[PDB]
Design an enzyme around this catalytic site. Structure first.
Site, PDB file in Angstrom:
ATOM      1  N   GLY A 157       7.166   3.201  -1.033  1.00 14.23           N
ATOM      2  CA  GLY A 157       7.850   3.558   0.193  1.00 14.23           C
ATOM      3  C   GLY A 157       6.949   3.786   1.404  1.00 14.23           C
ATOM      4  CG  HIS A 210       5.350  -6.442   2.564  1.00 11.36           C
ATOM      5  ND1 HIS A 210       6.192  -5.351   2.637  1.00 11.36           N
ATOM      6  CD2 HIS A 210       4.090  -5.940   2.535  1.00 11.36           C
ATOM      7  CE1 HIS A 210       5.474  -4.240   2.668  1.00 11.36           C
ATOM      8  NE2 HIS A 210       4.195  -4.570   2.603  1.00 11.36           N
ATOM      9  CB  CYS A 261       5.051  -0.495   3.140  1.00  9.38           C
ATOM     10  SG  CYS A 261       4.491  -0.785   1.402  1.00  9.38           S
TER      11      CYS A 261
HETATM   12  C1  LIG Z   1       5.945  -1.681   0.729  1.00 15.46           C
HETATM   13  C2  LIG Z   1       6.558  -0.869  -0.402  1.00 15.46           C
HETATM   14  C3  LIG Z   1       7.128   0.306   0.391  1.00 15.46           C
HETATM   15  O1  LIG Z   1       7.579  -1.568  -1.084  1.00 15.46           O
HETATM   16  C4  LIG Z   1       5.554  -0.327  -1.428  1.00 15.46           C
HETATM   17  O2  LIG Z   1       5.588   0.845  -1.620  1.00 15.46           O
HETATM   18  N1  LIG Z   1       4.588  -1.146  -2.188  1.00 15.46           N
HETATM   19  C5  LIG Z   1       4.521  -2.609  -2.070  1.00 15.46           C
HETATM   20  C6  LIG Z   1       3.685  -3.280  -1.166  1.00 15.46           C
HETATM   21  C7  LIG Z   1       3.663  -4.675  -1.153  1.00 15.46           C
HETATM   22  C8  LIG Z   1       4.476  -5.387  -2.016  1.00 15.46           C
HETATM   23  C9  LIG Z   1       4.500  -6.926  -2.028  1.00 15.46           C
HETATM   24  C10 LIG Z   1       4.075  -7.358  -3.430  1.00 15.46           C
HETATM   25  C11 LIG Z   1       3.550  -7.529  -0.994  1.00 15.46           C
HETATM   26  C12 LIG Z   1       5.924  -7.384  -1.700  1.00 15.46           C
HETATM   27  C13 LIG Z   1       5.301  -4.719  -2.907  1.00 15.46           C
HETATM   28  C14 LIG Z   1       5.321  -3.335  -2.935  1.00 15.46           C
HETATM   29  C15 LIG Z   1       3.679  -0.556  -3.199  1.00 15.46           C
HETATM   30  C16 LIG Z   1       2.656  -1.606  -3.695  1.00 15.46           C
HETATM   31  O3  LIG Z   1       1.815  -2.064  -2.964  1.00 15.46           O
HETATM   32  N2  LIG Z   1       2.623  -2.007  -5.091  1.00 15.46           N
HETATM   33  C17 LIG Z   1       1.608  -2.986  -5.482  1.00 15.46           C
HETATM   34  C18 LIG Z   1       1.017  -2.561  -6.832  1.00 15.46           C
HETATM   35  C19 LIG Z   1       0.581  -3.715  -7.726  1.00 15.46           C
HETATM   36  C20 LIG Z   1       0.288  -5.008  -6.967  1.00 15.46           C
HETATM   37  C21 LIG Z   1       1.506  -5.495  -6.189  1.00 15.46           C
HETATM   38  C22 LIG Z   1       2.208  -4.396  -5.379  1.00 15.46           C
HETATM   39  C23 LIG Z   1       2.803   0.666  -2.853  1.00 15.46           C
HETATM   40  C24 LIG Z   1       2.643   1.674  -3.821  1.00 15.46           C
HETATM   41  C25 LIG Z   1       1.812   2.768  -3.542  1.00 15.46           C
HETATM   42  C26 LIG Z   1       1.142   2.770  -2.325  1.00 15.46           C
HETATM   43  N3  LIG Z   1       1.309   1.783  -1.448  1.00 15.46           N
HETATM   44  C27 LIG Z   1       2.089   0.734  -1.664  1.00 15.46           C
END
Ligand SMILES: *C[C@@](C)(O)C(=O)N(c1ccc(C(C)(C)C)cc1)[C@@H](C(=O)NC1CCCCC1)c1cccnc1
Ligand SMILES: *C[C@@](C)(O)C(=O)N(c1ccc(C(C)(C)C)cc1)[C@@H](C(=O)NC1CCCCC1)c1cccnc1
Lengths: 305, 305
Positions: free
Chosen positions: A143, A41, A145
């Site tokens: 951040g 992603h 990920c």
């Molecule tokens: C990957 C990263 C660094 O952008 C991130 O922190 N997080 C994330 C992970 C996956 C996605 C998509 C939706 C698959 C593109 C976006 C952003 C966040 C995260 O997972 N936020 C979620 C919260 C609500 C549901 C959708 C996204 C993250 C935040 C804290 C800890 N781990 C990951």
């Protein structure tokens, strides 16, 4: 003496973490030999986070769109691929600090160490368990990920987890290093709920054995019980059922303490029915289930790496 | 989201650990530049563990009696000295993996990471606090002497603890890296008791702030209180008294949550008088006091090293 949530030394993994940028998203990658591994992603943009077609999004990307930094250094991508939910970026330089390693897919109830990273730089290390519902109760911020979970067996690092996302409930979901998610989760911004999170019974027993070794004796009782009758009590309190394989895995600890497994089950049963009465075990006021039988022996017998 | 007992990455310290043998005792040393640091009781033998005269025992030892190994390598001792309760062995080779470092003497209530080592090989890493009675509630087995505790500030390692001994009560005692013990403990096999171990109030408040940041809100109340009136309640429950410096140290967390320090004190007071009623905060069923205000912000804001 003493008992703590102990992680593995992180040195061997620290040297493997790099920063991966595709367009404007920056996350962590794992650099092993001449391949960098990261969640796919990274190639998403804002508007297609609801339902991205990763294959389609990948046709619009070439080697030079992926920027990989190891510290201040820059690495050259000479190939890229998608394996399930991870990207494999082939680079021109093999990591000089690659440890001996393997990829393993762990089972629920098993534990590992997590090196939390941001911008390809390690922030901290802690222990966690793969829960029976295939989430982990981690500590991760935006951040994080691409941060990885691992066990160490002497000189060999066994990678078992790569962090992909947080669920709206606050727990975390991710893949093995072949990119297959643990559990039924997908890498999209949809409503994803975890199922019932039950207690890992064999880990609670192991933790009672550790308490005994450290001199904490007050919960031991006169009673014994049977596998079937304990599992009756386990099911009412949402504990995983105990099998004879679990009994056998507890053999070493049973041998060291002189206490049979079924007598310890009898003690756990009373603690489930009557509670702990404001008392504590190993400094905790609830039954701890994120130490495996192996975690216990390593801590109370001194395995080195 | 989430909150765990998080240690610093141990890579920079791993590279510093060596094995030190004098006659037949083997313990861990810390190799920094061309000096190896270890507890002076490495030179003790069985019968003078009751009351050794280290100065006298040191006259019967020369450079070649001290064997230092860094992995399979062997280092040459070309000088030795005693500084308070640690030996400094001067060797012929400077550690190529020496990080930037300093020696610090920490205050009670402060926390650090411990790399538990055996035979000069790291076994695991965990967090702990210097208790108000100058013990630490560690996890250490026979052989763990010379293991060190540290904080990391970006690239610079601050060494604050070297493990020397276990007390018969099961808690642990040690020195700073200049060899002065924390607390009134001596390196002899005598009856040594720790004093009253009180709770680090400013750390409990910090931990309530972390709970709030993570959405755990149930303990917050309508009441407020005063510094003097809170400290009345603190003294009955064996909590360290709260000062205005403690209030000021909590400023960042207060600012982030919008909750004034004295309102959080009011919430802690009710939890001390009425208990938690079978509820839990941040996964724990008791008030946790081994996270400093800085530990909290680093975990819930993402500081890297
Ligand atoms: C990957 C990263 C660094 O952008 C991130 O922190 N997080 C994330 C992970 C996956 C996605 C998509 C939706 C698959 C593109 C976006 C952003 C966040 C995260 O997972 N936020 C979620 C919260 C609500 C549901 C959708 C996204 C993250 C935040 C804290 C800890 N781990 C990951
Ligand atoms: C140092 C080492 C490796 O031999 C050791 O494990 N321990 C130790 C420390 C100090 C001493 C003397 C008495 C100062 C020489 C001997 C041994 C033990 C330890 O501290 N045992 C004590 C228990 C009863 C009181 C006297 C010694 C150790 C064990 C577990 C954790 N840390 C240290």
């Amino acid at each position: 003496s003493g008992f703590r949530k102990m992680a593995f030394p992180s040195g061997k993994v620290e040297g493997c973490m790099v920063q991966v940028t595709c367009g404007t998203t920056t996350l962590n990658g794992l650099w092993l030999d001449d391949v960098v591994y990261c969640p796919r992603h990274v190639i998403c943009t804002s508007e297609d986070m609801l339902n991205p077609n990763y294959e389609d999004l990948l046709i619009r990307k070439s080697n030079h769109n992926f920027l990989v930094q190891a510290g201040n250094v820059q690495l050259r991508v000479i190939g890229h691929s998608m394996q399930n939910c991870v990207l494999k970026l082939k680079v021109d330089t093999a990591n000089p600090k690659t440890p001996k390693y393997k990829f393993v897919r762990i089972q629920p109830g098993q534990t590992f160490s997590v090196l939390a990273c941001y911008n390809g730089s390690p922030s901290g290390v802690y222990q966690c368990a793969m829960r029976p519902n295939f989430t982990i109760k981690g500590s991760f911020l935006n951040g994080s990920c691409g941060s990885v979970g691992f066990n160490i067996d002497y000189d060999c690092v066994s990678f078992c987890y790569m962090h992909h996302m947080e669920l709206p409930t606050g727990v975390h979901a991710g893949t093995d290093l072949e990119g297959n998610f643990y559990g039924p989760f997908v890498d999209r911004q949809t409503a994803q709920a975890a199922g019932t999170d039950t207690t890992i019974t064999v880990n609670v027993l192991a933790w009672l054995y550790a308490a005994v070794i450290n001199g904490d004796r007050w919960f031991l009782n006169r009673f014994t019980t049977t596998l079937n009758d304990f599992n009756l009590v386990a099911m009412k309190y949402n504990y995983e059922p105990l099998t004879q394989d679990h009994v056998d895995i507890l053999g070493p600890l049973s041998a060291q303490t002189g206490i049979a497994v079924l007598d310890m089950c009898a003690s756990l049963k009373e603690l489930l029915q009557n509670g702990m009465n404001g008392r504590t075990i190993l400094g905790s006021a609830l039954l701890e289930d994120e130490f495996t039988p192996f975690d216990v022996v390593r801590q109370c017998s001194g395995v080195t790496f």
